[PDB]
Paper text:
During our recent work on subtractive ESTs (expressed sequence tags) from the Carcinoscorpius rotundicauda that was infected with Pseudomonas aeruginosa, two isoforms of the non-classical Kazal-type inhibitor, CrSPI, each of 9.3 kDa, were discovered. Earlier, we have proposed that CrSPI-1 may act as an “on-off” regulatory switch in the modulation of antimicrobial activities while maintaining homeostasis of host proteases.
There were three subtilisin molecules and one CrSPI-1 molecule in the asymmetric unit. Each CrSPI-1 molecule interacted with two subtilisin molecules, i.e., domain 1 and domain 2 of CrSPI-1 interacted with two independent subtilisin molecules. The three subtilisin molecules of the asymmetric unit were identical with an rmsd of 0.1 Å in a pairwise superimposition of 274 Cα atoms. This indicates that there was no significant conformational change of subtilisin molecules upon complex formation with the CrSPI-1 molecule. The CrSPI-1 molecule comprises two domains: domain 1 from Cys1 to Glu40 and domain 2 from Leu41 to Leu83. Both domains adopted similar secondary structures (domain 1 β1↑β2↓α1β3↑ and domain 2 β4↑β5↓α2). The reactive site loops of both domains of CrSPI-1 occupy the substrate binding pockets of subtilisin. The reactive site loop (RSL) of domain 1 of CrSPI-1 (Cys1 to Lys6) binds at the active site region of subtilisin from P3 (Cys1) to P3′ (Lys6) in a substrate-like manner. In domain 2 of CrSPI-1, Glu49 takes the position of His3 in the P1 pocket of domain 1 and makes 8 (73%) of the 11 total hydrogen bonding contacts with subtilisin.
Residue numbers in the entry:
A (entry chain B), B (entry chain C): 1 to 274
C (entry chain A): 1 to 156, 162 to 274
D (entry chain D): 0 to 74
Amino acid sequence: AQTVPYGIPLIKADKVQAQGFKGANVKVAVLDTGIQASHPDLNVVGGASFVAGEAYNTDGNGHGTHVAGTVAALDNTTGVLGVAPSVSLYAVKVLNSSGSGSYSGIVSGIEWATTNGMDVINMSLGGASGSTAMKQAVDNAYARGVVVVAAAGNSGSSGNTNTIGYPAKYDSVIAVGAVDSNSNRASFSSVGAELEVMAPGAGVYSTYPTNTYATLNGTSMASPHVAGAAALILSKHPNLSASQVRNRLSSTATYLGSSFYYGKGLINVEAAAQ
Amino acid sequence: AQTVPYGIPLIKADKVQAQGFKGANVKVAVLDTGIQASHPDLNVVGGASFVAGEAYNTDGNGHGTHVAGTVAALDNTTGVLGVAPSVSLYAVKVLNSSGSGSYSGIVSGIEWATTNGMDVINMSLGGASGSTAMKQAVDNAYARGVVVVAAAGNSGSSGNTNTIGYPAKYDSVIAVGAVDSNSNRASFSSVGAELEVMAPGAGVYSTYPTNTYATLNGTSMASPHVAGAAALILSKHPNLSASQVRNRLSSTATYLGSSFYYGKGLINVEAAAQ
Amino acid sequence: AQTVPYGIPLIKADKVQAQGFKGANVKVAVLDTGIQASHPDLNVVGGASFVAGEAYNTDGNGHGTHVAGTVAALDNTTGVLGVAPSVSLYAVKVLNSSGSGSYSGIVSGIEWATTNGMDVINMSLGGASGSTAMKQAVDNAYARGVVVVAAAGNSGNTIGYPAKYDSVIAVGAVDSNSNRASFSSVGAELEVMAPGAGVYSTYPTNTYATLNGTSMASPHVAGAAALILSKHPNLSASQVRNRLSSTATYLGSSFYYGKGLINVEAAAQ
Amino acid sequence: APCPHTYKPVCGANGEVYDNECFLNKAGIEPAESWETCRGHELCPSVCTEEYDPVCVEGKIYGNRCMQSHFCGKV
């Protein structure tokens, strides 16, 4: 009754899981539209809400729940399987049911996750510009030992133009682009000099409210694959600093093309966690 | 794994630190909710508690710890960095877990501070009314060589209205307002003619109880910058009187506009310590 | 129509109930001002009274009924919802309508619970002094296999008795943000935290109310023990107790949080 | 001796707060019939940190909860 989305073996996370490392005791905050905690294939340990009138453990959108399942869908007898299924999953809600949020709310969630000792931040979200605050937040979070991952954007490419949004464009954040099951780049995946690594982001099957499953597209789907990978690395090497983890992902990636379009390549966690 | 908060370089405390003057031998007292002594990035060497049931080396609010971090966070391989990272740090607990206190409890700390020979007194606090026992506690502390700093308050401005709080409104105490990264005035910062200087009080990042870090607001974060900017003048020119360290900090400040809003302006630790 | 106080999902008691463990056949005694038995959302199954003139099926104060509600308010279309809504609930009146009791009154209550085979005792009450008879009563209850729970006190090391006894689980209070409440006591004996601020529960005269205190927090733990025992009926008093604190969510210094916020789902794994 | 641990604080005429009326009586203190008699407590604080963490309340909000509470005894 459990299905393994193709993305898991593609980044070879299935190999590292077989080694006995599943991100146990690693803390991961999903900064999104919240998460459907009551979902059977998800275990939301905690979190916070920076969206008025909404609790952190509901999800009127679906986006965040989907992202959560990709990072940490429970390895069990049903549904799907996350990249790091033993992770301590936290739902930090910074976007509402419509999918929208302010700069201050997102910053709030990043500051909370810093204060509260998250090991990894996933931000499947962004915009044309960021803010001085948002920057200060990610830098500090990164300096604290938090692997900070973000979707790069879905604005595609056109000649010479850079289409990476914030926070992905920040250098303390891992900007993550998307490929399909063929390891080919997705036509929507943003491009730019800051593009760091690629991960599955097209036809991604994961959890979805209410108690169901859904196939989505976007770099929002790709980001959480890297987020999970970071958690796997840590479960095998709890010693590693944020940089050491990040660099392992980017310098063991399978080559896929020019870095303006593919960054350093497709993540390979088996190689990363050597 | 140690970031320097944007406060250190903005008041130019990094320039002075680079000359080797980091505030060693200077005794700074934080009159707050206490300090988390066991925090890795903090060395609390002394102090006293004036709240029943709790010691001086614990902080049950977080505020105190986050104020003292902005002053003397250990210059090490981790955490953050304080304005005067070499200061001898003393924790005078005058507030409760809720960040509240009585005029009597504060007078007590001031007095304890005068008796044990603190070089700098920081007070990130303030009531709307004063008390003669507190105006007396400070006046008798300033005259004895102790530099007294305090938050100007977060009462903002409307018309000619003076919104400065005590013990910041006293002439024997340095009233410190708050600015952001861009050197602009925090719209919550108290106005008035007693207002003396400005300092980073917007998105200030520092130590926080139970071995972590938080990003806080308020003139409470602005004060430990000036409190630390004094501990530096006294490591480089350790022969100046309390009035000389003070005159230097205010004269060598950067004018930012009307002194009813910015006071003298953003302190320049580099210039004040030339 | 039924309202789930934030405290139930906060200690994750809904998740455990969802498994099908609701404290069935677990005997819980609320040593308090009595319980309004006739309240639609409460089912009082027995008890005793040590307050001259009053039976156990009334509560002239309100406190006792609030605490009981948090432990075992009926899973309904109505009112609120307890941590262990299937529990076998007993009112043991040891405090009068003004809420005050004597050491011997409370001792009688403890002894009655021990004798009548209660699994759990809740004591949302405290004093500055102890008493040898009281220390002797709780020690013997615990030694016989009673999980003894008490409110750490709101004095704010100002923990009182019987929470201060080591055969008793000392419970402090957090709010819906998981933050320690100003009024929560601190010290070396503080064992775990539970929701105690803004707690909404049954209140005498077929109504409901919101109270603050470690008195509100204690019954969450008492209820947490009923849940654990309906799932693992065979555990000892010390096993249940250790299972509650060793799986607590860390909150900070144990002087202020003890082991931290209880987590029944974890505790009941 | 022995009271319920609800926190319904009461101001003693001696300038000290008690957790609820039952504790007030065990100590033998009288009600103050004036919360001012307990200035600088929490329900009636005369101090506050200067952290900016604003609260509703009404028009004259409050830099923080302590500043909002600097208006005695209220609910």
